[PDB]
Design an enzyme around this catalytic site. Sequence first.
Site, PDB file in Angstrom:
ATOM      1  N   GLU A  48       0.817  -1.212   0.000  1.00 11.44           N
ATOM      2  CA  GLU A  48       0.000   0.000   0.000  1.00 11.44           C
ATOM      3  C   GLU A  48       0.852   1.265   0.000  1.00 11.44           C
ATOM      4  O   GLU A  48       0.574   2.219  -0.738  1.00 11.44           O
ATOM      5  CB  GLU A  48      -0.935  -0.023   1.213  1.00 11.44           C
ATOM      6  N   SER A  81      -8.799   6.600   5.862  1.00 15.37           N
ATOM      7  CA  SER A  81      -9.554   6.230   7.064  1.00 15.37           C
ATOM      8  C   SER A  81      -8.737   6.528   8.316  1.00 15.37           C
ATOM      9  O   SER A  81      -9.229   7.151   9.271  1.00 15.37           O
ATOM     10  CB  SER A  81      -9.944   4.743   7.019  1.00 15.37           C
ATOM     11  N   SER A 139      -1.191   7.414   7.700  1.00 13.89           N
ATOM     12  CA  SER A 139       0.186   6.934   7.675  1.00 13.89           C
ATOM     13  C   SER A 139       1.109   8.099   7.346  1.00 13.89           C
ATOM     14  O   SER A 139       0.790   8.917   6.483  1.00 13.89           O
ATOM     15  CB  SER A 139       0.405   5.830   6.628  1.00 13.89           C
ATOM     16  N   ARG A 153       8.017   4.266   7.185  1.00 17.90           N
ATOM     17  CA  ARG A 153       6.809   4.734   7.854  1.00 17.90           C
ATOM     18  C   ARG A 153       7.200   5.256   9.231  1.00 17.90           C
ATOM     19  O   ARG A 153       7.528   4.471  10.128  1.00 17.90           O
ATOM     20  CB  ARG A 153       5.783   3.607   7.965  1.00 17.90           C
TER      21      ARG A 153
HETATM   22  N1  LIG Z   1     -17.305  10.208  -1.201  1.00 21.33           N
HETATM   23  C1  LIG Z   1     -16.651   9.868   0.019  1.00 21.33           C
HETATM   24  N2  LIG Z   1     -17.104   8.837   0.743  1.00 21.33           N
HETATM   25  C2  LIG Z   1     -16.503   8.481   1.891  1.00 21.33           C
HETATM   26  N3  LIG Z   1     -15.440   9.168   2.364  1.00 21.33           N
HETATM   27  C3  LIG Z   1     -14.947  10.221   1.681  1.00 21.33           C
HETATM   28  C4  LIG Z   1     -15.552  10.588   0.462  1.00 21.33           C
HETATM   29  N4  LIG Z   1     -14.891  11.643  -0.001  1.00 21.33           N
HETATM   30  C5  LIG Z   1     -13.921  11.941   0.846  1.00 21.33           C
HETATM   31  N5  LIG Z   1     -13.930  11.103   1.897  1.00 21.33           N
HETATM   32  C6  LIG Z   1     -12.964  11.123   2.972  1.00 21.33           C
HETATM   33  O1  LIG Z   1     -11.910  10.331   2.504  1.00 21.33           O
HETATM   34  C7  LIG Z   1     -11.538   9.443   3.517  1.00 21.33           C
HETATM   35  C8  LIG Z   1     -10.961   8.191   2.907  1.00 21.33           C
HETATM   36  O2  LIG Z   1      -9.775   8.477   2.220  1.00 21.33           O
HETATM   37  P1  LIG Z   1      -8.979   7.367   1.419  1.00 21.33           P
HETATM   38  O3  LIG Z   1      -7.602   7.969   1.076  1.00 21.33           O
HETATM   39  O4  LIG Z   1      -9.706   6.913   0.138  1.00 21.33           O
HETATM   40  O5  LIG Z   1      -8.835   6.207   2.466  1.00 21.33           O
HETATM   41  P2  LIG Z   1      -8.818   4.646   2.323  1.00 21.33           P
HETATM   42  O6  LIG Z   1      -7.659   4.267   1.366  1.00 21.33           O
HETATM   43  O7  LIG Z   1     -10.197   4.159   1.864  1.00 21.33           O
HETATM   44  N6  LIG Z   1      -8.508   4.136   3.865  1.00 21.33           N
HETATM   45  P3  LIG Z   1      -7.086   3.412   4.339  1.00 21.33           P
HETATM   46  O8  LIG Z   1      -7.275   1.882   4.276  1.00 21.33           O
HETATM   47  O9  LIG Z   1      -6.873   3.839   5.769  1.00 21.33           O
HETATM   48  O10 LIG Z   1      -5.875   3.867   3.481  1.00 21.33           O
HETATM   49  C9  LIG Z   1     -12.745   9.248   4.372  1.00 21.33           C
HETATM   50  O11 LIG Z   1     -12.384   8.907   5.678  1.00 21.33           O
HETATM   51  C10 LIG Z   1     -13.396  10.580   4.300  1.00 21.33           C
HETATM   52  O12 LIG Z   1     -12.950  11.443   5.312  1.00 21.33           O
HETATM   53  C1  LIG Z   2      -4.525   1.344   6.117  1.00 23.17           C
HETATM   54  C2  LIG Z   2      -3.658   1.749   7.294  1.00 23.17           C
HETATM   55  C3  LIG Z   2      -3.840   0.750   8.404  1.00 23.17           C
HETATM   56  C4  LIG Z   2      -2.214   1.725   6.844  1.00 23.17           C
HETATM   57  O1  LIG Z   2      -1.956   2.715   5.897  1.00 23.17           O
HETATM   58  C5  LIG Z   2      -4.065   3.154   7.784  1.00 23.17           C
HETATM   59  O2  LIG Z   2      -5.419   3.171   8.126  1.00 23.17           O
HETATM   60  C6  LIG Z   2      -3.317   3.706   8.993  1.00 23.17           C
HETATM   61  O3  LIG Z   2      -2.138   4.024   8.929  1.00 23.17           O
HETATM   62  N1  LIG Z   2      -4.039   3.868  10.242  1.00 23.17           N
HETATM   63  C7  LIG Z   2      -3.359   4.393  11.430  1.00 23.17           C
HETATM   64  C8  LIG Z   2      -2.690   3.271  12.191  1.00 23.17           C
HETATM   65  C9  LIG Z   2      -1.870   3.879  13.302  1.00 23.17           C
HETATM   66  O4  LIG Z   2      -0.721   4.318  13.057  1.00 23.17           O
HETATM   67  O5  LIG Z   2      -2.332   3.949  14.477  1.00 23.17           O
HETATM   68 MG   LIG Z   3      -5.651   4.253   1.500  1.00 23.40          MG
END
Ligand SMILES: Nc1ncnc2c1ncn2[C@@H]1O[C@H](COP(=O)(O)OP(=O)(O)NP(=O)(O)O)[C@@H](O)[C@H]1O
Ligand SMILES: CC(C)(CO)[C@@H](O)C(=O)NCCC(=O)O
Ligand SMILES: [Mg+2]
Lengths: 359, 359
Positions: free
Chosen positions: A128, A182, A185, A197
């Site tokens: 990732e 979500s 990082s 990281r």
């Molecule tokens: N249409 C949408 N729906 C849901 N969330 C959104 C949307 N647009 C923006 N966001 C925001 O974008 C965030 C998710 O960002 P994103 O970079 O796509 O994470 P992710 O890759 O799904 N999660 P992770 O597994 O932690 O890397 C959400 O937590 C919201 O704050």
């Molecule tokens: C998808 C992950 C788990 C890794 O990129 C992301 O949600 C993250 O970094 N969460 C924070 C984890 C922590 O450092 O407490």
């Molecule tokens: Mg992501």
Amino acid sequence: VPGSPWFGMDIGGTLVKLSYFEPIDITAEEEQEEVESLKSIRKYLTSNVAYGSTGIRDVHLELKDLTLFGRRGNLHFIRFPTQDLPTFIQMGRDKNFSTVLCATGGGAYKFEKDFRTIGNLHLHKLDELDCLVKGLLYIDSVSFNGQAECYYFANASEPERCQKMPFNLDDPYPLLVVNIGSGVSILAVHSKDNYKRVTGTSLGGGTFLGLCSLLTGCESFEEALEMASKGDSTQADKLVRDIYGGDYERFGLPGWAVASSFGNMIYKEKRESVSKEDLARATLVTITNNIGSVARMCAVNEKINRVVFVGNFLRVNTLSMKLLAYALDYWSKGQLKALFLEHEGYFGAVGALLGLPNF
Amino acid sequence: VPGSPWFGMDIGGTLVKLSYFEPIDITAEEEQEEVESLKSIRKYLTSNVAYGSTGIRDVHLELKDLTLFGRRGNLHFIRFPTQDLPTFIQMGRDKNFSTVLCATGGGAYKFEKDFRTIGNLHLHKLDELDCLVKGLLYIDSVSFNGQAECYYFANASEPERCQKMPFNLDDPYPLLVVNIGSGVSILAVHSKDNYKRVTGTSLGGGTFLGLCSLLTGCESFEEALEMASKGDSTQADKLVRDIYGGDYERFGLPGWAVASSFGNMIYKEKRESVSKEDLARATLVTITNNIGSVARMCAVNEKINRVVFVGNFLRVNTLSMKLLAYALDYWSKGQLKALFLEHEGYFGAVGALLGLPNF
Ligand SMILES: Nc1ncnc2c1ncn2[C@@H]1O[C@H](COP(=O)(O)OP(=O)(O)NP(=O)(O)O)[C@@H](O)[C@H]1O
Ligand SMILES: CC(C)(CO)[C@@H](O)C(=O)NCCC(=O)O
Ligand SMILES: [Mg+2]
Ligand SMILES: Nc1ncnc2c1ncn2[C@@H]1O[C@H](COP(=O)(O)OP(=O)(O)NP(=O)(O)O)[C@@H](O)[C@H]1O
Ligand SMILES: CC(C)(CO)[C@@H](O)C(=O)NCCC(=O)O
Ligand SMILES: [Mg+2]
């Protein structure tokens, strides 16, 4: 490189991001050898900007006439909720579509067995954070159709002057990358192949959206931002002046700075008067400033002065970007700069696509 | 040192802390010269453990037979909400009480004019973080009635072995002090006279209590902790295994770690099933672990391995203390130690009292 559509996919905790390379140099003979399913995929993706009820093509981000893997084409950027990945996979198993899929993010692992229900599909799981770095460096190197991919907010401490300006990353190392998805990082990038990281925080975009939903009843990220744009976070936060009657002068904390986020919500009468919009804005400010603080501490410890913030927490979220720019500039007396990138949360998906020639 | 009761007061954003030195070596002639008001104050403070409806004497913290300013006495520890300071000041203006008051915390400034309504009272404002350092070093130096003032959790990563143990601070420098009140201040202490505020965070005890009140309807800190003790934070938080289906192995994030605090609350069906107790515990865990992370980053950058956590966010809060001990020990592979002090949130008030001879 393979007869197969060229995709890269980043399956995150909340959103799936898909990069799709549409060839535009197809010869007369190539159209002949193209099977109907491949033509059907290309037409569906390029003739629609909404896919089903929750898929969206971000047309404004399209890179046009990109040369990739020796072919000229357009790079497209598509997102949909991870909750709807079963619909994507059920679409993929349709008989009208009978691929080498480079996939990253946690869902590349979580949904590995589900992707393998698509007959003969070859899934390659890629890391990732490696895809994030490779995609970020690639998109900045090819430019945003001739414009800068990277920007900053000039004079971020003065609203009468604060304005988005292009920023040149032609020698991007070293670099702190703060990926606000979500969760968060944080990466220290020393070269294209040398990064670590540094840490992360679980108080990320999902904390904003989850708390906002609980507190205000909002039903979408966009609605949460709309509410926050109308609110006054100081109705929920306890400020330094609420504790001191003014500045805390000895340690340079101005009276308007937040002393305790949501700290005025310990009083019942204040809980009864605060608005949903106030609470949305307090949630945004609290989450954003906490990330800015963590980012600042990491930059100081890594001895890095350029901090790039990516991830979809910041899509259509100028308020958070300006808060981050102001906080880094203010606390560092100008020595740290917040940087932002036009392609938002798509870098992992691009980095995955770039892994295709290795298979 | 002055005919006046000896108090030190720390007027915080949420709580007032009062230290009171009760002389126990009063001679026959001294009782004669004592005016009725002074006798009335001493009897009221020492014969009651609850003062009005919101004042509490923490009897278990009393230091007995302390020698202070050349006199032997007992040091008492009293707290009440800052919201009720008008009642304290109205009590002080009572005719039955007609003092040099060393005061710290933000309220020493905010309520300066109010203290001066007490006829001829001499108010001396002392710095909030200087009093904290001086009081912390003093109480550890005099011991807790012969026992250690400082403790840690041995084997903090194993619940079958985890247990409170005394810790010797006889050479306490250098030291990171994390003061968790309404908001959080972090100090790097290099000597008794050489310390700096490294940073802070506005996500402190007031964020826990304010968010908990909004989310669960709790009406007191104690009720919030009671709810959190019964909850399951994983019903609100999105974990690494919810994103990966397991560990994120490449970067050593175990599946049970939180990836996004409150991140499962973006789904309506999960918001409808989560309990108030779950939400209280998720709030506690989120706030506590964020402080632990910031504390760890500050310790690494300051090159300090002992981190002392104080402030009333941790009073009667073993869950947060154990979370902090585990987090520092786990992330540092044992190189950082979380330390705790029996006198909780009273160090500023003690440090103020120690300023008396300077006036
Ligand atoms: N249409 C949408 N729906 C849901 N969330 C959104 C949307 N647009 C923006 N966001 C925001 O974008 C965030 C998710 O960002 P994103 O970079 O796509 O994470 P992710 O890759 O799904 N999660 P992770 O597994 O932690 O890397 C959400 O937590 C919201 O704050
Ligand atoms: C998808 C992950 C788990 C890794 O990129 C992301 O949600 C993250 O970094 N969460 C924070 C984890 C922590 O450092 O407490
Ligand atoms: Mg992501
Ligand atoms: N009886 C209580 N009432 C209110 N809060 C309590 C109580 N007991 C513990 N707390 C917690 O203690 C915190 C306040 O700690 P405290 O160290 O007294 O801060 P303060 O000095 O009043 N604030 P600050 O101005 O930021 O230093 C609250 O935010 C709660 O989380
Ligand atoms: C009373 C203050 C303001 C100072 O100790 C305390 O609440 C605090 O440090 N709040 C955090 C301020 C910040 O660093 O963002
Ligand atoms: Mg305080």
